[PDB]
C-alpha cells in the first residue's frame, strides 16, 4: 500500500548517497539492496535496473521544480535556491546526461524527462518575462535573463568543487545567501 | 638592437601559431615539430626558443597573467572603477576556448614537476594578481558601490559568472542569436552584481 512508498523512496534515498559518496559507476544494484537490507529480488519489483533509479532520481528532480511554479520576487529567489542548493547533485546529474539520457535506455522514462524539461524551461520563460513586464527586469529577450541565470548557476557549482571554496572561503553559508540576491538582483532594469 | 628584436619576433610567432594549433587540433596532438613546421623553422630553432611543449604551455599561462596584470594598470584617465571593473569581465569573457584550454593545462603542466621555474613564477603572478583583483573590490566596497561584504564574496561571484559564461559558449545551444547583444549584456551583469 503506502508502505510501497517507503522502500521506494528507502531504494531511491540510499543510491543517491551512495552515488556522491562513491561514484555512480561504482555502485551497482546489490550494494543498494544490502545499504538499505533487502535482496536485489526486492529491488527489481521497484526498478527494473539502475538506469530506471537514475531516471527516477532525475524525474524527481524536475517534478520538484515543478512543484515550485505552483510573489515573483520570492519565487525568482526560491528557484535559485533550489537550483543551488545541492551542487554534488547538480553535477551527478550533468553526468547521467550523457551517461543515460542520451542513450537508447529506459526511453520511456528518458521521454517523460524530456517533457518535464520543456515545460520547466517554458514556466521559468513565462516568470521572466513577467517580471519584465513587471518592470523589474531589463526589457531584453527572455532568452537573455536565461542564459544568465544558467552561467550562474552553472559556474556556483563549479566553485563548490573547488580548493579555493573549501579552505579560503570563509562563511559559506552568507556567501550562499549572497549568491542567491545576486540571482534575484541581475538584469535589473 | 635587431638581434633581440627579431628573436622575440619569432618567440611570439612561434606561441601564436602554437596556440592557434593547440585550439584547432587538440594540444595532445600538437607537436613541437608541427609547430616548427607550421612556422618555417625546424627543430633546431624552435628549441633555442622552447626546450619542450610543456615551455610553450607554460609561457602561454605567464603572457595570459602578464596581460591581466597590465590591466591593472590601466590609468584613470581612461579607465575609473567601474570602467576597469568592465575591463576586466571583458578580458576574462572574450576568448573562451583559451580559458577552456589553460584549465587543462592546470592539471597537465601546472601541477605537475615540468618547468619548475616558469611554474614557480605562475604563482608569483597569480598571486600579486589575485591581490590586484581584491584591492579593486574593496576600493569598489569604500566608494559605496559594492555591498559591504567580505571581499571574497565578490571575488567568487565574479569567478562563477566567468566560469559559466564560458561553459554556456562550449554548449551546442542556435539558442544566443545576437551574441553580440548578450556578451555586452553579460558584462553589464558582471559590472553590476553585488552592487549596493
Excluded at 39 to 59: D, Q
Excluded at 99 to 127: D, G, Y
Amino acid at each position: 500500500v503506502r508502505e510501497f512508498r517507503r522502500r521506494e523512496q528507502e531504494i531511491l534515498d540510499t543510491a543517491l548517497k551512495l552515488f556522491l559518496e562513491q561514484g555512480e559507476d561504482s555502485v551497482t544494484v546489490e550494494m543498494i539492496a544490502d545499504a538499505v537490507g533487502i535482496g536485489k529480488g526486492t529491488i527489481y519489483k521497484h526498478f527494473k535496473s539502475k538506469a530506471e533509479i537514475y531516471l527516477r532520481l532525475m524525474l524527481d528532480y524536475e517534478r520538484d521544480l515543478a512543484a515550485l511554479f505552483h510573489d515573483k520576487e520570492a519565487l525568482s529567489r526560491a528557484y535559485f535556491e533550489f537550483r543551488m542548493r545541492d551542487p554534488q547533485r547538480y553535477r551527478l546529474f550533468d553526468r547521467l546526461e550523457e551517461k543515460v539520457v542520451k542513450t537508447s535506455q529506459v526511453p520511456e522514462m528518458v521521454e517523460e524527462l524530456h517533457k518535464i524539461r520543456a515545460s520547466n524551461f517554458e514556466r521559468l520563460t513565462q516568470l521572466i518575462k513577467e517580471r519584465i513586464a513587471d518592470g523589474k527586469l531589463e526589457n531584453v529577450p527572455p532568452y537573455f535573463h536565461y542564459c544568465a541565470a544558467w552561467a550562474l548557476v552553472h559556474g556556483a557549482v563549479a566553485l563548490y568543487h573547488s580548493p579555493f571554496w573549501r579552505e579560503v572561503l570563509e562563511d559559506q553559508e552568507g556567501f550562499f545567501h549572497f549568491l542567491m540576491d545576486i540571482g534575484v538582483r541581475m538584469g535589473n532594469k
